[PDB]
RNA sequence: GACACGGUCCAGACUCCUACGGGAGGCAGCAGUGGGGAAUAUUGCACAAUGGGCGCAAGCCUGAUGCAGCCAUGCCGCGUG
RNA sequence: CCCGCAGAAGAAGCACCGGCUAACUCCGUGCCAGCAGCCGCGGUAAUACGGAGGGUGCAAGCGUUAAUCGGAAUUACUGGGC
């Protein structure tokens, strides 16, 4: 199936994910249809600290796609502050 | 690494004063500067038009205190930017905060400001920072740590810069003991004696 | 600013130094006065070298700052960060046997060690020695074999000593064998006690008085004024007075039982050292102090390395080497040399440096002697005559082996008779072996080990000839007639 | 092939076993690689003290 | 430099380019070249000529001669 | 969904076990050994995070992956006042 | 990542110096020993070989070799000739 999931970007101790739409058979980085946003557990107040299209959220998931814990929980938590 | 060794060799090599001395003395009375280093330098031999561009380079690499690879970076950045090269590169080098904070007054040789900024004695907008090739940017604002606000090489800093000319980008206070950098200079308000083209065709080759 | 004082400079001295250096080394005000110093106070020349110690005598007479410099110091560093424990516990003994007849190389052994499927092996000669922690009645002793036969005679050596009690097999029929009798001084040498049985008495025809009689002929005391000899009688295959020999030994290591450090830093022997595929390098090492573990760094000789794994004798995993007790171990860096000290070290990054500086020195030194040789004889070699060389490459399972070997062949060497061997090396025959006896006019020998396809490749394609032995008895007389084929 | 030696005085024999490297000499016609001094049994050239690194002779000890 | 062993020898005879084949006193041919300094002095050697040769360790098959005799 | 790295059958070579009657094997997966070469490493810790398989879930598995050890191999910043 | 302790205290080598190409003088040998990328040094006046003093360039690195492109308009389409 296709899904939204957490690629790993960035340098030790330095995480960047990129929220990405995929096929669950490929690998963490491999092939992927659509890059949606980003997020970083790091940044400091003084930047943005994350970022979704919600858009194509909707579109995927009514396609039929599903979404991982982490994914989920961020989409809850913009939706809070948005 | 950074060059130990004695300093009026490099000025006599040069055969110009190259202010790596307090000055609480002449020049004069302390080498005879004519003569080149070394049991032959009483001869003046011929210089070819590569030897006087190394020279030159040298020249400018000697007084900012800069290692080789360093400067390739600097010529490197200078070459990406707009504008003239040498005006560019010029104010690269003056960039740096160990020629800033000389510049500003707080110390007597380059060599002596390093040191201090290495030692973790002075903050750019209220934040220590150590290292000496820092970049610099324009309205921030520079001072020294109470802590080493004591020193009193830095009180005789403060007042043996007095003697020398003032700069006209830069602005300082000896009632705070801090100084705000304006605004970054062009090549007008820097010496004469600095010859850019021959930096430049050399490096180009 | 300036007072009046004499030179009292900080001066760093080598181990060995000169005048004409000796003179701006210290900057002294006397230029010459400094020379008429050393020619005043001993034999000395304007060209003379004087030696560290002399030069801090010499730094001593000038009052000067002296700094002495040695190049010895990275052994010392590396032995002060050695641990040192000031606990001693009782050890067990270490003892060696020197039969050198396959009856008193194993049956003495078989009837106390569990079985003799280890004499199952042919050659009939005990081709390697063995190490076995037995313990025997309440008592843990260390048993060690001997091969005891042809030019194994510097193999017994390495073993002579490092044990504690010596014994051994007296044939009353043959009185004392030849390389029995070169084995014993080794121990009465030592200074080591001695004790002996009479072994193989199952025979009725013995003559164990005219034996205990000839003990003071032997060159040694007779027990019955209580001197060093035992008239400890055993038997190889009824076997009575073996438990006997096991009271005796009992008796003399109460007599002996000394106590060594039981914790911490453990330093041992190389007794046995070969090349197996998994394994690699193979380390048994007897460890006479301390406490081996996975992990230690471990340097012997100018090799080294971490013990990845240690087992016993029936190859079963060990978490530790009990000190007094044989392990086999790998993680060496390559074949330890026979005989090393084998010593625990504290940090990683220094023992690198430590063998390197070993090796180096070592080769300076062996190229030294082969090149003075080769230049110094040369044009004395300008004359010729008559001269058999044989020129042989060796492959052997383990280093004594190698050494031995070598050693026999070297040995037979006559004035016109020559076995020049090329090189020789432990493990399989490869193709740098192939190619160099195929380079010179040798043969490749393979003694108790094979060879592989590279190796095989070129031969084939070559037509060298390899050799192939297990006994060491029929690979002398092979090559005896060899050498002896040559002539006229 | 042929390898021309560097430094005054050599250490090889009719079996020795070398490092050799790039480079050649004019003079002797075809000569086209130079042996390495200080690598495996051709030792360094004995007392000099200017260019240590090329022939490979260490440091002179204090 | 290091010390050269010296002998003396014949001419036996005379090879292209000043190159010439050697007996010595001990009864071992060599092959032996001018020095410069002949080269200078315009001396010539011919077959039969009582000559002086040094040689090397490095290489006893060649020889080098350097003083010629009457 | 394969004509299937850690599945099956046949043939070949090679290695190993044996009562000789017969049997077993496939690191170009992670470490590691031998050999070749001028030349290239630790038989490490953990599923805390990302991702994957199974389950309702708790949870289990993962030498992927996260982190560590060795190496002046390189880029880069600092000191030896 | 921060604070305290003591002490200049625990820390600089490599290559080059005849022209190309930045930087010279003496001693030791005497077309020898040797250097060399090329032209070429060395036969008793060697800034070119070895040592020393001085100098030049890089720097926790410095050199040699291997290899691709450039210099080569020396495969020339841009851009060569008979
Ligand atoms: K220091
Ligand atoms: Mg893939
Ligand atoms: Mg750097
Ligand atoms: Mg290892
Ligand atoms: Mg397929
Ligand atoms: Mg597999
Ligand atoms: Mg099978
Ligand atoms: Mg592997
Ligand atoms: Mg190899
Ligand atoms: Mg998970
Ligand atoms: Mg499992
Ligand atoms: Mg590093
Ligand atoms: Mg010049
Ligand atoms: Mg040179
Ligand atoms: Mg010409
Ligand atoms: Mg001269
Ligand atoms: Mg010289
Ligand atoms: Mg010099
Ligand atoms: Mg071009
Ligand atoms: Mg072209
Ligand atoms: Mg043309």
Redesign the pocket.
């Known amino acids: 199936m296709v899904?939204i999931?957490?690629?790993?970007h960035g340098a030790?101790?330095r995480?960047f994910?990129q929220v990405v739409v995929a096929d669950?058979?490929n690998?963490?980085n491999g092939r992927f249809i659509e890059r949606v946003g980003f997020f970083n557990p790091i940044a400091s107040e003084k930047e943005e600290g994350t970022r979704l299209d919600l858009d194509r959220i909707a579109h995927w998931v009514g396609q039929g796609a599903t979404i991982?814990?982490?994914?989920a929980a961020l989409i809850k938590e913009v939706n809070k502050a948005a | 690494?950074?060059?130990?060794?004695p300093k009026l060799?490099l000025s006599r090599?040069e055969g110009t004063d190259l202010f790596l001395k307090s000055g609480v003395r002449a020049i004069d009375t302390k080498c005879k500067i004519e003569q080149?280093?070394?049991?032959?330098?009483a001869?003046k031999?011929?210089?070819?038009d590569?030897?006087v561009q190394?020279?030159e380079?040298?020249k400018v690499?000697r007084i900012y205190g800069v290692?080789?690879?360093?400067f390739?970076?600097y010529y490197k950045e200078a070459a990406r930017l707009k504008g003239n090269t040498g005006e560019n590169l010029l104010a690269l080098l003056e960039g740096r905060l160990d020629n800033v904070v000389y510049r500003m007054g707080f110390g007597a040789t380059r060599?002596e400001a390093?040191?201090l900024?290495?030692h973790?004695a002075i903050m750019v907008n209220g934040r220590?920072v150590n290292?000496?090739?820092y970049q610099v940017s324009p309205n921030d604002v520079v001072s020294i740590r109470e802590?080493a606000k004591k020193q009193s090489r830095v009180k005789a800093a403060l007042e043996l810069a007095e003697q020398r000319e003032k700069p006209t980008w830069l602005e300082v206070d000896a009632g705070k003991m801090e100084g705000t950098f304006k605004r970054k200079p062009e090549r007008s308000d820097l010496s004469a004696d600095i010859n850019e083209h021959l930096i430049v065709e050399l490096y180009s080759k | 600013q300036k007072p009046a004082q004499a030179v009292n400079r900080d001066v760093v001295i080598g181990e060995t130094i000169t005048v004409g250096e000796l003179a701006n080394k210290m900057a002294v005000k006397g230029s010459q006065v400094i020379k008429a110093m050393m020619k005043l106070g001993a034999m000395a020349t304007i060209n003379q070298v004087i030696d560290q110690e002399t030069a801090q005598l010499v730094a001593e007479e000038m009052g000067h700052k002296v700094i002495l410099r040695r190049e010895n110091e990275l052994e010392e560093a590396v032995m002060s960060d050695r641990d040192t424990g000031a606990a001693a516990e009782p050890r067990a003994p270490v003892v060696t046997i020197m039969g050198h007849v396959d009856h008193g190389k194993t049956s003495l052994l078989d009837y106390i060690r569990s079985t003799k499927v280890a004499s199952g092996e042919a050659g009939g000669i005990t081709q390697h020695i063995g190490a076995y922690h037995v313990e025997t009645e309440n008592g843990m002793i260390t048993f060690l074999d001997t091969p005891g036969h042809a030019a194994f005679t510097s193999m017994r050596a390495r073993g002579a000593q490092a044990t504690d009690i010596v014994v051994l097999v007296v044939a009353a029929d043959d009185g004392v064998m030849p390389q029995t009798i070169e084995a014993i001084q080794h121990a009465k040498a030592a200074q080591v006690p001695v004790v002996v049985a009479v072994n193989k008495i199952d025979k009725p025809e013995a003559d164990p008085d005219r034996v205990k009689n000839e003990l003071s002929q032997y060159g040694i005391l007779p027990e019955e004024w209580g001197g060093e000899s035992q008239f400890v009688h055993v038997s190889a295959k009824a076997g009575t007075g073996i438990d006997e020999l096991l009271d005796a030994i009992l008796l003399q290591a109460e007599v002996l039982e000394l106590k060594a450090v039981r914790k911490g830093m453990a330093s041992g022997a190389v007794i046995e050292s070969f090349?197996?595929?998994?394994?690699?390098?193979v380390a048994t090492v007897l460890v006479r102090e301390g406490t081996l573990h996975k992990?230690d760094i471990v340097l012997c000789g100018f090799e080294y390395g971490?013990v990845?794994?240690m087992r016993n004798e029936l190859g079963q995993e060990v978490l530790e080497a009990g000190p007094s007790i044989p392990v086999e171990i790998?993680?060496l860096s390559?074949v330890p040399a026979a005989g090393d000290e084998v010593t625990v070290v504290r940090d990683?990054?220094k023992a690198?440096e430590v063998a390197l500086y070993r090796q180096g020195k070592f080769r300076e030194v062996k190229l030294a002697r082969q090149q003075k040789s080769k230049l110094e004889n040369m044009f004395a070699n300008m004359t010729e005559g008559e001269v058999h060389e044989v020129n042989i490459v060796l492959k052997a399972d383990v280093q004594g082996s190698v050494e031995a070997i070598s050693d026999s062949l070297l040995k037979l060497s006559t004035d016109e008779v020559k076995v020049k061997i090329i090189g020789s090396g432990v493990?399989?025959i490869?193709?740098?072996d192939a190619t160099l006896a195929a380079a010179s006019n040798a043969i490749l020998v393979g003694f108790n080990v094979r060879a592989?396809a590279?190796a095989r490749k070129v031969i084939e394609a070559e037509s060298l000839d390899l050799r192939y032995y297990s006994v060491i008895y029929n690979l002398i007389d092979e090559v005896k007639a060899a050498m002896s084929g040559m002539l006229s | 092939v042929t390898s021309?030696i560097?430094?005054?005085?050599?250490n090889l024999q009719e079996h020795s076993v070398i490092?050799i490297?790039?480079?050649?000499?004019?003079?002797?016609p075809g000569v086209r690689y130079?042996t390495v001094r200080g690598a495996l049994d051709c030792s360094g050239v004995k007392?000099?003290?200017?260019?240590?690194?090329?022939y490979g002779v260490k440091?002179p000890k204090a | 430099?290091?010390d050269?062993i010296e002998m003396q020898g014949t001419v036996l005879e005379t090879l292209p380019n000043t190159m010439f084949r050697v007996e010595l006193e001990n009864g071992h041919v060599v092959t032996a070249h001018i020095?410069?300094?002949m080269?200078?002095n315009y001396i010539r050697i011919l077959t039969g000529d009582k000559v002086t040769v040094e040689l090397?360790p490095?290489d006893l098959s060649k020889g080098?001669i350097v003083f010629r005799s009457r």
Not at chain 2, 67 to 70: G, P, S, V, Y
Not at chain 4, 21 to 28: A, T
């Open positions: 899904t999931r957490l690629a790993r030790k101790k995480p994910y669950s058979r690998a963490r991982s814990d982490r994914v | 690494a950074r060059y130990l060794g060799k090599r080149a280093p070394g049991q032959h330098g001869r031999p011929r210089l070819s590569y030897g190394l020279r380079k040298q690499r290692l080789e690879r360093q390739r970076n060599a390093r040191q900024v290495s973790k220590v290292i000496a090739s802590k | 090349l197996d595929k998994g394994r690699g390098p992990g971490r990845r794994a790998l993680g390559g990683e990054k690198r493990g399989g490869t193709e740098t592989d590279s | 021309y560097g430094g005054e005085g050599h490092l490297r790039g480079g050649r000499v004019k003079d002797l130079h007392d000099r003290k200017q260019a240590r690194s090329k440091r | 430099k290091e050269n020095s410069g300094k080269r200078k090397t490095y080098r």
